[PDB]
Amino acid sequence: SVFSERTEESSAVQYFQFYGYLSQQQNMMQDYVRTGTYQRAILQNHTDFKDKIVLDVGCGSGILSFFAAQAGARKIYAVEASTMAQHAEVLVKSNNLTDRIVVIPGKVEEVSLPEQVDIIISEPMGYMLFNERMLESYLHAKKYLKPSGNMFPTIGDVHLAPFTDEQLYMEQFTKANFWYQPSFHGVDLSALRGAAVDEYFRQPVVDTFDIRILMAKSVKYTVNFLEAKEGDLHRIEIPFKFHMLHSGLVHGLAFWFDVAFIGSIMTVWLSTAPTEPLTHWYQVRCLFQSPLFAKAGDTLSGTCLLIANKRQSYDISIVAQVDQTGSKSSNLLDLKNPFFRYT
Amino acid sequence: SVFSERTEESSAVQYFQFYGYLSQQQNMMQDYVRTGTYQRAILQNHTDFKDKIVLDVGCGSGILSFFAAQAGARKIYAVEASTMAQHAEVLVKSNNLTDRIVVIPGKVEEVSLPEQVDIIISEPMGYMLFNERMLESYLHAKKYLKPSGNMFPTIGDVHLAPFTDEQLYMEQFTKANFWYQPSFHGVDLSALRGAAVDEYFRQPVVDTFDIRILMAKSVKYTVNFLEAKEGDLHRIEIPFKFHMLHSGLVHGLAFWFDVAFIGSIMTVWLSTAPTEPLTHWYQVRCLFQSPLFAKAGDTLSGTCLLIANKRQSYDISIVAQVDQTGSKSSNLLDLKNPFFRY
Amino acid sequence: RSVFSERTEESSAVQYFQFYGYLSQQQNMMQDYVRTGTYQRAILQNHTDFKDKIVLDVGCGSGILSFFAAQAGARKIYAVEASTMAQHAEVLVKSNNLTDRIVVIPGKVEEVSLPEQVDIIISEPMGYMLFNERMLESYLHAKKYLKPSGNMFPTIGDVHLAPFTDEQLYMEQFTKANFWYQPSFHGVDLSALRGAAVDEYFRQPVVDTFDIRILMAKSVKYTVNFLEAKEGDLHRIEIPFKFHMLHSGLVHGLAFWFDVAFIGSIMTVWLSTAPTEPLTHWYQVRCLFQSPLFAKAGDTLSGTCLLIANKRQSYDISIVAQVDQTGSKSSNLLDLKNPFFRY
Amino acid sequence: SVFSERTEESSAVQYFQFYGYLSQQQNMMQDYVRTGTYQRAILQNHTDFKDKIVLDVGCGSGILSFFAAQAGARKIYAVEASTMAQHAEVLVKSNNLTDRIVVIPGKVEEVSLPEQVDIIISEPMGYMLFNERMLESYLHAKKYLKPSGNMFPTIGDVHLAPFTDEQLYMEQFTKANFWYQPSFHGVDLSALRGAAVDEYFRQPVVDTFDIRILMAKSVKYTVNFLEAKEGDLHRIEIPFKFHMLHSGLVHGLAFWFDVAFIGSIMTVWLSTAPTEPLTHWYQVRCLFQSPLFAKAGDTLSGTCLLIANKRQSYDISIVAQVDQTGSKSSNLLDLKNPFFRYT
Ligand SMILES: COC(=O)c1cc(O)c2cc(NC(=O)NCCCCCNC(=N)NC[C@H]3O[C@@H](n4cnc5c(N)ncnc54)[C@H](O)[C@@H]3O)ccc2c1
Ligand SMILES: COC(=O)c1cc(O)c2cc(NC(=O)NCCCCCNC(=N)NC[C@H]3O[C@@H](n4cnc5c(N)ncnc54)[C@H](O)[C@@H]3O)ccc2c1
Ligand SMILES: COC(=O)c1cc(O)c2cc(NC(=O)NCCCCCNC(=N)NC[C@H]3O[C@@H](n4cnc5c(N)ncnc54)[C@H](O)[C@@H]3O)ccc2c1
Ligand SMILES: COC(=O)c1cc(O)c2cc(NC(=O)NCCCCCNC(=N)NC[C@H]3O[C@@H](n4cnc5c(N)ncnc54)[C@H](O)[C@@H]3O)ccc2c1
């Protein structure tokens, strides 16, 4: 019911329909960075799992629970709300781990868990880290976490950096200018050009890019999953002050994220940065409505305010200005309707 | 409401949310074969519109209503349930047609019209013709049609033919082969092999192909929109008997459709066949989990059974057998989870 | 009871020696200029190892190797052959006026009796993967006639193995077995035999040549020193391996080839069947994995190839390979007596 | 048993190992002429199977038994001596036909059947019809056949015809002349040229061919499987008198066969003639050691004598003369070492 109160029915239906497909599980499993890093984090921190209780929030096919089993976990509660729970049950049975892994179909906010656990494992990251709003289910699950327990991942760092991409910015108007013709099959479409521009600029661009478009060291906003409450994610204000390393027109902000698995033996990092091999998270770019010229040495400052909505996503408000000149820009984007541009 | 009772709210939300985007409207309008053919059908049959009352079911941005206006329609009621209705109204005003195009926001099953109409126009065809279940709304609108009124399009021909395409079969078979792995990172996935194959082959393959892959002349199934009732599209049974022209493996059936605008001046055809230029409908192929072998001269008999679901799509059942040998193939597909391949 | 018959199902020996009794088979072996030319170079260029020496030719066939020893100046060559090709060898010895130097002795080297101990043994005991046909044991068995200072031509044999990637080959075999998926072949459901078919097809070693760019790591080498090895050594051959992957991608199996060296007194002459060398009538051999292993460049692929000699003059092979980083293991059986000739 | 007395233990081992491979069953099942005609013959004569007792001699995977079940047979005893019998049992179970099909592992000469049968079905044809000597097992099975029972196939027609193929003839001496060189790597091989020629000419050529190489209407030799006895096939004398339709050199005799399923409703034919689509029986050509010139209208008379051997094959003796000139030729061939020439 915590989940229910913060989610529209129609959004939850699709959301779990999407993750009920084995083709989707397979896509996530075939991401070697994602899968290998989760395995290393768990196996290389075996003392955090050996003979321990484990909670797996949104286990999907259950791959992370088998890794926890490989590390010697005594008992693992694997919670999954989609129909994938049935397939996870099959793998538990076929891998002779019914005594160690128990699949619980349902949402972690609603299911009954019998005991407190020593550690919670999960993959609740979406685009820009926060999209899909499952980090709140991850943090909600800490009601079953012993005091002094641990979280895998333990922290999440979202990175923001200004970028220049003249061709991406102009692409928006080339597409919108379809409407700027007085006789499309005899019809004057011009009146809708402004609405088309507005529509395109509300879409965060999901794809990857050359790191040479980034004009400044990124700014990092950290969520400590051991300390955070799920309420901390309803409104996420990310201040930024970029020390411009390059001179040129800034067309928007680029987003990626890292997560760290802070175990007793070592810390393992999973990065979706553009300096690292591409993942199924890709990167995310939000354009300013107008570009801001910035010289190397200038400071570009502002805030990125993420306001959670009931569509399991966020409304993104970005305000930015070049301090040395006062030039200002902004944009308001809907993270639930991104434009998949990757080629 | 008829629409609400046959549709899960969840599906309707996304459905109308999808067609409320100007980018989607642009994508459909830039299909020149579609837009140019609809304009030809309408303008070439201008006498079917001159001083006539028109209903445009699901008008989107209103392009079809403007065509009706260009052809001389006295008054056009343009119904649209998505938020695109407000954009259409903007275009009506900016094109100075307020006296002839009247946008009516809402579902055609729910709104009220002040008068009966002489002709209904619409673009209700989806993948495989029937996907998205909008033909039922199109036929539902006939409650507003005068006796002996016309419909544009007037009929719809679904074509189906067996094909051979080893690449396609192996491509989908290979994906499903991921779940045979006995030790993926030390995990036995083999238990879920059967479920993966089932899922992958339930997906209709949406794309185009060279006509050379077809192993027999197509079988036609015709829906006459002037006669069909919307209840007719709840359960669609298409029997087929193919006379094989080439020997080899039949990996499935290929689907496409044509619609005809039977006007008073001339009949105009809109075809999505693989012999014709590509459209945003492409073609659709249903794969058999196991290919059937046949020799030239054999007959391939069976039935394609389409049952409409509450998600605005169809549950597909394809039974096919080679009569000469008794080799049978039973297949089930989920038109709501296609594989966009092109 | 002779050593040969004790270890050989009589049904296999009759077929085996009938195969080599045909003159067409001798022609095919002799027309391999790499084989025949290299054997002659190893003998003639180490002539002092033969001049006025006693020679044993094990499995002489038509006798070509005995004639090479005679060209090098051997005092006496005992040419042992168990097939009916022995009679043809006698004809060539007479027609080449070498009756005073080449003495054909029909029978099996395990069963015949020689008049004297010999200085050097010559033979072509190599089959596919070096070990197929189990003739190396007859070669090693013949050392009962070898003088203390004796020598063996070949002297050593190097088995090479390396992981390869070859999607076409894997699909080709996987497609053949797909025949047994059919639920209604002429109205008959064959699907219950699908697993048995794939097992059968993937037990077949692929006798083929290939481009070296399919290999994903440097080859591992297993050496057999024919001077030191005992006949019993080849009943169980254990080959461990630890490959350092040079390329990322799917590992579809292991490729095998072999080199032998004629370590003479004047020089060592090498006969190589490697894919980097001209093709021979041994080709190369690949053992496919029913399920390919994914590995990344820099990962380690480790395991063991174990050959257990059977009564059909061949080996039952088990290949267990695992990607160390992830625990992805592949276990495979191969019947070296049912090869798939792909060439 | 009768089988063990007429078969060398060694030949049998290899024989049943060959048919124990699913890949071999698959190849026979994929011959659409073979599989499709057997199905048509059985199904279109359903009254010969409806509520009838059936014996399937050498059922392999069991497909012919399944056709007999499709035709409504009450009880089918499917006898198979290879290890394929275990796979046939798996298919009977998975096809829910255990109530009507009983797989009996073993040789039809040695197993015991619980009752007599109404009809025997089998695929006993080899190359030249008689190769592999399976027809004797087929006839031997008639000890279980009721009086006035039927056989499927019922009869077999072997067709002989003289052919001209200069290039096939000359191909034999091109291959054998490899031995006709005085210094192959310093060795004089010429003494074995005659033996190499002999060996090549003793090989029946398994191949297909354009029907235009035939020079006279074929001659037919018929075995009636309802009347013939096992011993009738130990010595098969086929006289022939060809009336040459074309002038030229005759290089040998071509062989093919038809079988007829004489059912109650109709007769169905399975033909392997060179005018019909190719089957896995191909055709067989036996060369004359010396060709014979014949004018159109001349008469080529002679005999083909087939003598069974314990290698499950036949020694072939062919003598032929042109009556108008007395020109004569012979040849002795061994049907167990055919030359597979098709490509
Ligand atoms: C409008 O349309 C669009 O344009 C659009 C909109 C979108 O949002 C899109 C999103 C996509 N997705 C994606 O980016 N995929 C790649 C990144 C890897 C993500 C890996 N992590 C993850 N999020 N999995 C969580 C697991 O936990 C389970 N779970 C969740 N809650 C619970 C709970 N309360 N109790 C138990 N289980 C729970 C879940 O069911 C699931 O199994 C793709 C396409 C999209 C397109
Ligand atoms: C696997 O991934 C998925 O999950 C997935 C699965 C799928 O099946 C997908 C299928 C897609 N399909 C497509 O490509 N579509 C565009 C091309 C054909 C355009 C043909 N034109 C047409 N039928 N337009 C309807 C108009 O009529 C209006 N309307 C309708 N009813 C009413 C009513 N009762 N009252 C008033 N108005 C109404 C509507 O709002 C709208 O304006 C795309 C994406 C898909 C993604
Ligand atoms: C389709 O799949 C199959 O069914 C299949 C399966 C197979 O394994 C197949 C194998 C093939 N063979 C081949 O070419 N492989 C490559 C080797 C190149 C040639 C290397 N030469 C050699 N092996 N030397 C033996 C000589 O030494 C004599 N000998 C032996 N022991 C003794 C003894 N105790 N005393 C005296 N003499 C002895 C012998 O009689 C002979 O003269 C072909 C086809 C095959 C097909
Ligand atoms: C030596 O190297 C060569 O040069 C060579 C020599 C050859 O002769 C070769 C021949 C080949 N073969 C082929 O392509 N033939 C074409 C037609 C195949 C149609 C099937 N014909 C058939 N005879 N199958 C009988 C079935 O009945 C089973 N069976 C048999 N007896 C009994 C019994 N007493 N009780 C129960 N079951 C029994 C058996 O196991 C089997 O299942 C290929 C390669 C060859 C190569």
Residue numbers in the entry:
A (entry chain C), D (entry chain A): 136 to 478
B (entry chain D): 136 to 477
C (entry chain B): 135 to 477
Show passages lifted from the paper.
In fact, compound 12c exhibits a submicromolar activity (IC50 = 0.42 μM) only against PRMT4, with a selectivity for the latter ranging from 20-fold (over PRMT1) to 122-fold (over PRMT5). All six cocrystallized compounds (12a–12c and 12f–12h) adopt an overall similar conformation in the complex with PRMT4, revealing two common anchoring platforms, the methyl 4-hydroxy-2-naphthoate and the adenosine moieties, each one occupying the same binding site on PRMT4 regardless of the different linker lengths. Regarding the linker between the naphthylurea moiety and the guanidine group, a length increase from three carbon atoms (n = 1, 12a) to four or five (n = 2, 12b, and n = 3, 12c, respectively) brings additional van der Waals interaction with W416 and Y262, thus substantiating an increase in affinity and a corresponding decrease in IC50 values. In fact, longer compounds 12f–12h showed IC50 values in the low nM ranges compared to the μM range observed for shorter compounds 12a–12c.
Protein arginine methyltransferases (PRMTs) are important therapeutic targets, playing a crucial role in the regulation of many cellular processes and being linked to many diseases. We also report crystal structures with various PRMTs supporting the observed specificity and selectivity. On the contrary, we were able to cocrystallize the compounds in the complex with both PRMT4 and PRMT6.
